[PDB]
Amino acid sequence: GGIFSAEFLKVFLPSLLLSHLLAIGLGIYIGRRLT
Amino acid sequence: GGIFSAEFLKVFLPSLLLSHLLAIGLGIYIGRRLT
């Protein structure tokens, strides 16, 4: 495995999820704001 | 100071930007088809 593995993954696996998910939210806000 | 490092960054730094941009796009599509 990796050196940090848990440590690095602990702050990498969820970080990405938030980025993608959060991004989706933005799109919705923009769209719903259209009409 | 790792195995990939260089080869890793070459496909790690840009991937993030694409993820967010692509993600936001998804939201916009879904949102525009709300009301």
UniProtKB/Swiss-Prot annotation, chains A, B:
Compartment(s): Mitochondrion; Mitochondrion outer membrane
Domain of life of the organism encoding this protein: Eukaryota
Bilayer-crossing regions: 11-31
Subunit annotation: Homodimer. Binds to BCL2. Interacts with BNIP3L and ACAA2. Interacts (via BH3 domain) with SPATA18 (via coiled-coil domains). Interacts with BOK; promotes BOK oligomerization. Interacts with PPTC7; this interaction promotes BNIP3 degradation.
Record-stated family: Belongs to the NIP3 family.
Role noted for this protein: Apoptosis-inducing protein that can overcome BCL2 suppression. May play a role in repartitioning calcium between the two major intracellular calcium stores in association with BCL2. Involved in mitochondrial quality control via its interaction with SPATA18/MIEAP: in response to mitochondrial damage, participates in mitochondrial protein catabolic process (also named MALM) leading to the degradation of damaged proteins inside mitochondria.
UniProt name for this protein: BCL2/adenovirus E1B 19 kDa protein-interacting protein 3
UniProt source species: Homo sapiens (Human)
Residues of the full protein shown: 154 to 188 of 194
